[PDB]
Structure formats: C-alpha cells, structure tokens
C-alpha cells in the first residue's frame, strides 16, 4: 500500500475518529501514524482512526 | 473620548468546532452528579464509549 501498487477499502460501519492538523509548509510522510495505529489493533478492539 | 470593547460572542480561531459538554454554562445548583464532556476531535474520546 505504501508503494503505489495496492489500494484497500476497509468496511467499517461507524467508528470513533481523531485527526491532526499539520502546517501546509512542512513536507512529511504520514505513514508512521497509520503504522502505529495498526500497532494497536487486536481482535478485542481498535483505536480511533487518525 | 472613552472607549468600550465587548468580548466577541463567537469563537475566533483558525478552526472552530462544536463539542458536547453538558452544563458548560450552568449557573444554579450543583445539579446531578452525572456528566458528559467529550474532548475536541484532536484527542481520543474512547474513554466515553
């Protein structure tokens, strides 16, 4: 997915969502946010979507 | 030659949102010992669910 070769659709009915604000004049890659988000998903429950 | 300036009624920020904070403008009695106050979306409101 991180490479431009695969696209994923996740079927979630509803969920708690959080968000972050970034300065437009600062180049960045947001991969770590998703990565750590995945690092907390278990069959018991999931953290909020960033 | 006197000057007055009222504080504005609406929030003045880069981004303004609406959040659920019960009794945030309460003035009378202490009220029921029950409360619901979610944080702004920039935080994690899991603890409420």
């Amino acid at each position: 997915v991180k490479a431009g070769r695969t696209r994923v659709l996740v079927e979630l009915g509803h969920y708690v969502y959080t968000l972050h604000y970034y300065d437009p004049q600062i180049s960045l890659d947001e991969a770590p946010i998703l990565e750590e988000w995945l690092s907390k998903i278990n069959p018991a429950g999931i953290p909020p979507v960033p | 030659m006197q000057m007055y300036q009222m504080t504005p009624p609406l929030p003045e920020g880069a981004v303004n949102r609406i959040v659920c904070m019960t009794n945030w403008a309460s003035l009378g009695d202490e009220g029921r010992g029950l409360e619901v106050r979610l944080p702004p979306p920039t935080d994690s409101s899991v603890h409420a669910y």
């Binding site: 907390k40 998903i41 069959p43 018991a44 | 029950l34």
Partner: peptide, 30 residues
C-alpha cells in the same frame, strides 16, 4: 465524572485468551 464498571470474569478471561501480537519480527516483510 462518568460511570464505568467491569465485565464478568468469564467474559474477560475468554477475551484475553485471544490476543495475537500486533507486531512480530520476521525476516521477510518488504
């Protein structure tokens, strides 16, 4: 304040019994 109470012990036990590791260490991960 807010209200929160623990679940039944049996429910907690079975739930905890199924918690695969989120991140593992394997030599083939791209």
């Amino acid at each position: 304040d807010i209200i929160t109470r623990p679940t039944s012990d049996s429910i907690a036990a079975v739930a905890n019994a199924t918690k695969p590791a989120a991140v593992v260490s394997d030599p083939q991960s791209m």
